[PDB]
Design a protein around this ligand. Sequence first.
Ligand SMILES: CC(C)(C)NS(=O)(=O)c1ccc2c(c1)C(=O)c1ccccc1C2=O
Length: 507
Amino acid sequence: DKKWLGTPIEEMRRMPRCGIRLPLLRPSANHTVTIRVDLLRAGEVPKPFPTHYKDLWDNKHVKMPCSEQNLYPVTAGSRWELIQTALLNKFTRPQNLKDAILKYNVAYSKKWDFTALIDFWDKVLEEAEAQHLYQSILPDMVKIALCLPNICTQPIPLLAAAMNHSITMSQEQIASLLANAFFCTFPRRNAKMKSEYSSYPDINFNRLFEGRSSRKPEKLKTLFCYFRRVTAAAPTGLVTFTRQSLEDFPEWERCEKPLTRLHVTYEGTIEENGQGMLQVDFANRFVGGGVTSAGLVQEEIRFLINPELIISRLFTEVLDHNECLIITGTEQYSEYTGYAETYRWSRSHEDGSERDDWQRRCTEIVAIDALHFRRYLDQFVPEKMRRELNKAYCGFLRPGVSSENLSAVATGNWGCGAFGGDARLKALIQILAAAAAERDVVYFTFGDSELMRDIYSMHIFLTERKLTVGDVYKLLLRYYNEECRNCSTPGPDIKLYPFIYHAVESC
Ligand SMILES: CC(C)(C)NS(=O)(=O)c1ccc2c(c1)C(=O)c1ccccc1C2=O
């Protein structure tokens, strides 16, 4: 029983080795660069551009906590002056941190529960660990949070619905903003009945502090490992956030492109074994899912080990069906064990990834949200199948870039879990989208040895028969018509892979 099947992993494409020498990094109408490109040097902390803080308090930019327009009725008082007074206090007990956060969040003093913060500090941490948190970590986090106007000098545009826009900022700038999110300083991001930011994920970390879930200390340890690292020694690299939407989608039934190569394995992970590859994040439409709340599956774990991903929540609007978010340069700060209810923070991780010409770690992650199916048979509906293909296609396609400069896609069981996705159908959908996007697939089954063989055998059968993307999509439509459309039973009589084998072998 082989641990992997198909094309050997060495024959696949990886970054930055398959990376077409980056053009000169520069701001444009579609690219926001928040640092001095001319002064960008390996191992040096980037210099913010502009030199002095410029504010934009409008419908198109992040509303900064340090904005002179961040005011509260007291007569208008400065909310930033208030944050400074509240946070520049000695913390010696968890109650001190809760009281400080709530001084500039009065309206939420009875709505925000801090049980997990109090229990982490008092009931989980040993005395010396609790001592290091309040004497060192927390004050260092306060100073970087309060440094926001000197660090994040340029207004950050919102990556709104249908925008094809990028933001390149420093990891230092991300650390100042994530320190602010921890202290819940972002204004207009808290109300349940909020309109302006209703289509945006939560950014402030208040939900990380609530309840008695045994996974809250693991999240907090994962997060404090990051905060300790970035306050102790300023990170030097950059990170790019790109919102992508495609105007024209393929006419799937008509696609003459052949299938690409497949490496399928029941061992390994996307982060370790998918180095230099386009790494899929099985995302929630509000990027990050329950990272700073309850969730702790594939997406939340990635956002906890690479905390720079979380900041996407500050500016990324809920993804529409034709959109994805591409994040390049996030660094891995933690190692972990388990998954979901068994997830535990292990130790600090020293990211060995090389950096590209823009000082970005050579780690490309794409957030693509699968559909949630109320009923199992819903996913076989042609509209639902086309949607999934178009989602993954937009996530894999790199407009302008040629086939030979495209790394393999590092993926697995996308949308299969609480979302009700069928692993075998989703594997074929990603295989077809990668084929149309002219990329090979590296598929991780995470201990599921039978699924590895099933995907492999089906990929090799269609490949050997020279079945195009169109031919395979036409078989999916026949499956729906024959087995799903007029089926009143919760499940079909025959499964998808046996239908395909029969349909082809009888043709
Ligand atoms: C989570 C991330 C993005 C940091 N890495 S990863 O490569 O995507 C991955 C590693 C391990 C597992 C899974 C995914 C997974 O989905 C899973 C599902 C059901 C049971 C166990 C696991 C599991 O251990």
